[PDB]
Amino acid sequence: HSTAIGRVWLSVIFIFRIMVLVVAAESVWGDEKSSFICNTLQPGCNSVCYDQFFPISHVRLWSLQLILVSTPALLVAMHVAHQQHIEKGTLWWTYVISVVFRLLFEAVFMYVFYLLYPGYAMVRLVKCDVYPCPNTVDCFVSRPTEKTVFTVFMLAASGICIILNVAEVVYLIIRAC
Amino acid sequence: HSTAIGRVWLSVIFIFRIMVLVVAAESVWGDEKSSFICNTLQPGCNSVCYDQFFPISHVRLWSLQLILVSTPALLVAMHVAHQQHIEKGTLWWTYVISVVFRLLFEAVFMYVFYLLYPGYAMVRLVKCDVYPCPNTVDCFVSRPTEKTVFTVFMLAASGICIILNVAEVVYLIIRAC
Amino acid sequence: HSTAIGRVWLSVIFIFRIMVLVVAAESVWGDEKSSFICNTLQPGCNSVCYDQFFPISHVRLWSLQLILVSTPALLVAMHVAHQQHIEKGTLWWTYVISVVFRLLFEAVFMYVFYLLYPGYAMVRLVKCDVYPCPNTVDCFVSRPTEKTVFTVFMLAASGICIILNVAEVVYLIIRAC
Amino acid sequence: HSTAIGRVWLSVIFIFRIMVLVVAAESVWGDEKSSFICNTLQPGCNSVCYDQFFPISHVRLWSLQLILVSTPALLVAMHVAHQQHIEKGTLWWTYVISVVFRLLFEAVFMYVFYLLYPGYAMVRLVKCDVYPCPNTVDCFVSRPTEKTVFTVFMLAASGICIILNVAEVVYLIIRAC
Amino acid sequence: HSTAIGRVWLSVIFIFRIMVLVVAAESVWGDEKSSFICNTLQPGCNSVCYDQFFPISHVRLWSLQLILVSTPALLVAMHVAHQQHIEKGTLWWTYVISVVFRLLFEAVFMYVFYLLYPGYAMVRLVKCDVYPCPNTVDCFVSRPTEKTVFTVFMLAASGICIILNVAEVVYLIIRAC
Amino acid sequence: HSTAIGRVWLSVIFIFRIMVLVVAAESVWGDEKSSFICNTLQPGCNSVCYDQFFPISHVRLWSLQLILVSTPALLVAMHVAHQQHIEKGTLWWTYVISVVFRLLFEAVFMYVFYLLYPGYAMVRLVKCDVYPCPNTVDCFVSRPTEKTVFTVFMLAASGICIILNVAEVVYLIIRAC
């Protein structure tokens, strides 16, 4: 019932994103806070500086994005199961709405990533002047390069997903006409 | 036998809550106590201050809420299985009672969350004057911003669940009349 | 073959107890010993004080109670399978004996909990004077409030199980007469 | 083909032992070495004293005992599967030999437990004079009381298994005559 | 439909690589950063030196390589499932393209491994002069020999995979002619 | 198609080895490096001494041995599946070659174990004079006795496997004649 190009490629990219996120969360981001250390004797400086520079981790943002993108499909599948229960083209329009919602969810999460972390690259040293840290202190980020590489992978996959969703919408519209 | 709107949407929101809780418990709240540090030399100040400011963690409250909400459905399913065994509209009234009980459980857990943690936001610094901490000491909370974001997500999902349960009850009453 | 009220409610409460124990063991009681600290310079004081005040953890007692309660049912199921193998009301009396044994196991574990930990509430500070700790030292318990809440939940569930088992026995006796 | 009393009771006790061992290994014995501390400034004293007083942990001995007891049954099942393949009372004698081997394995492991750890109870303080510890030093054992309780449980279960195996052998001999 | 030699040998080598990577990631590379220590009093020297000498771990590179190699096959299987859905030699050419893409992915990952880590062997001591480390400091790598052995295993397996893919392409071309 | 004695006994011993390795890896060898401490103030001495005395852990060697022994059987099973696909005594000779390869893999791993760790027993104290450790320092090995016991178990099982493989080859040759 769905288009040929859409489902297969979207599922493959989604599985790739899930695998990459699993690897990165299991390994790369495990000690992002425990090994985060600042050059100071001020108690509590490490925690406040980490909170200031990492309001929410990249892994958590990616997990939330994947969940939000998935629940359209779960809702559509539940509605299809309910239709089957009733049995014992509004479905097409519902599928279009779900695809559109997935596209907006991806775009919103990309914009949030841009707002929170301008730039894909992660730096080794950050300057933190948040209370109670006196003046400005230097803090050091765990595995900036590996995190940058995984961030690039996730952003490229998300952009590919966005383009694929747009192409799927265009193809479905052409099918309608 | 049940209403069209209710089961699908409630199940989707419940699965979303489960996924969010799994992510947050696995990652965000893991080091809520180990990295909780106060600015003092008093032994035992950290533990008593953490206990005073976090009588029970947000993750544990959400887990208890999900279990309490779930066991109505488990009890109804067990009763249905027992009815099937007997085979080898009291069921409708039992379903209404279970939905009502789920609604009250959600409302009670929301009220408990309001009582224990007034306000969704978590602060970086807390003032603790609990024995044996001398005078008032400053203590620093791990990942206040990420915890605030996840708390907002869970509260919004719980409110949506409450509204959906109320709408389901109203729809079932309209069906009765 | 069994009573209507008994099996469903007992299974629901048992599953609730299992879920609560899983959550508490995974989260609440993980650092009960590592974060247990006393105010002293005496080596080995922490370990002996923890052993004196926690001969066996609440989680371990609950796990042992659940296993002991379960093995009646496992033995009855194995005997039923053996009867099926023989095929290729002594069963009723065996079921009554198993229910009675479960009731006594619950009562004995409740009495043991009363003996070891008089009172549901857990205190923040304990006074320990066990060798080699000099005079009396103060030791601080991790998460007393959350542990108290979970203890209350488990005790209420166990009491409900005891009452349900007694009611099941009475109903079965009435069926006999 | 087997006796009525034997298989069911032996399987129930074996499952009980497995559950108890799982709980104890997951929880009780996790920090047996990390929290093992001696009252000395000598480097390496903790490790040598722990090795001297715990050549092999109770959990590891129980795991080895369970594996050794199990592999008779696994070998018998594999031989039965091979007989089925051949199809596409030597079996009785093989079953007797397997039961006898299980009985000797249980007895040997009980004797090893007696040799290594005379007495079920675990003490809080041990006196260690192993090189390079100077003179005699005091070392403190983690959770002696809980370990003693679990040791008592495992020893009682093992003794019940031994008695059950002996009774099964006697019953099978009576069947032969 | 596929060649005799290719699928079986490629699957066996892929499973071998997966098993080796699982073992190494679980055990060898767990403490690559936590036990990475430099001989200095400069705060943050350890983290920057580890980032400089390990931009991305060997385990993460191998995981990414395996995922990238796998997704060709997953995409081909999804396309085959879509063809089956349509049912309710373009496939040959698609299989050739997927095999070619796997070969290039293996070659690119081998070249990346050569660029990042010239030489299979890992050294015990590295010289790090990255800010803020003053002058040049010595840092010590955890388990260089075991990591070297596992690196040799993975590189040999990857080379065997490359040769097997080339042979499969040649055999398929010969089949075409 | 295979011999009666071979498959059953080899599978039983292989499963026993897998279980023992799982237990030992989960428990005994977990802190082989973290608790490895030398008597010195030299930074990096612990890591270089551990690398010098443990180039690769016993658990990792056993895991590699089991994987290498297994992949013959996996390759043979894959070839059998391919033969089944073709359907939709070269197999005997392939089975002999696989058994021979397993025997050589076991022998080679035994020889490697002899080379790396002469003697089954593990000592408490080792003398390390590897740079940058000044002169000779004493280092202490975690759980030498338990590791020795598990090493003896694994070596005995491996020797039994070697003898069983040789006997299987002899029996198959006798079958050929």
Curated annotation (Swiss-Prot), chains A, B, C, D, E, F:
Location(s), subcellular: Cell membrane; Cell junction, Gap junction
Known outcome of mutating residue 124 to W: In CMTX1; moderate
GO terms for biological process, alphabetical: cell-cell signaling; gap junction assembly; nervous system development
Highest taxon in the source lineage: Eukaryota
Outcome, altering residue 19 to V: In CMTX1; localized in the Golgi apparatus but also forming rare small gap junction-like plaques
TM region positions: 8-30, 61-80, 91-113, 152-174
Consequence the record notes for mutating residue 71 to A: In CMTX1; moderate
Membrane protein topology class: Multi-pass membrane protein
Outcome after substituting residue 70 to C: In CMTX1; mutant have a higher open probability than hemichannels formed of GJB1 wild-type
Extracellular side: 31-60, 114-151
Outcome of mutating residue 173 to V: In CMTX1; localized mainly on the cell membrane forming gap junction-like plaques
Effect of residue 79 to Q: In CMTX1; non-functional channel
Effect noted on mutating residue 49 to F: In CMTX1; moderate
Disease listed for this protein: Charcot-Marie-Tooth disease, X-linked dominant, 1: A form of Charcot-Marie-Tooth disease, a disorder of the peripheral nervous system, characterized by progressive weakness and atrophy, initially of the peroneal muscles and later of the distal muscles of the arms.
Biological function: One gap junction consists of a cluster of closely packed pairs of transmembrane channels, the connexons, through which materials of low MW diffuse from one cell to a neighboring cell.
Family per similarity comment: Belongs to the connexin family. Beta-type (group I) subfamily.
Protein name, as recorded: Gap junction beta-1 protein
Gene: GJB1
Residues of the full protein shown: 16 to 217 of 283
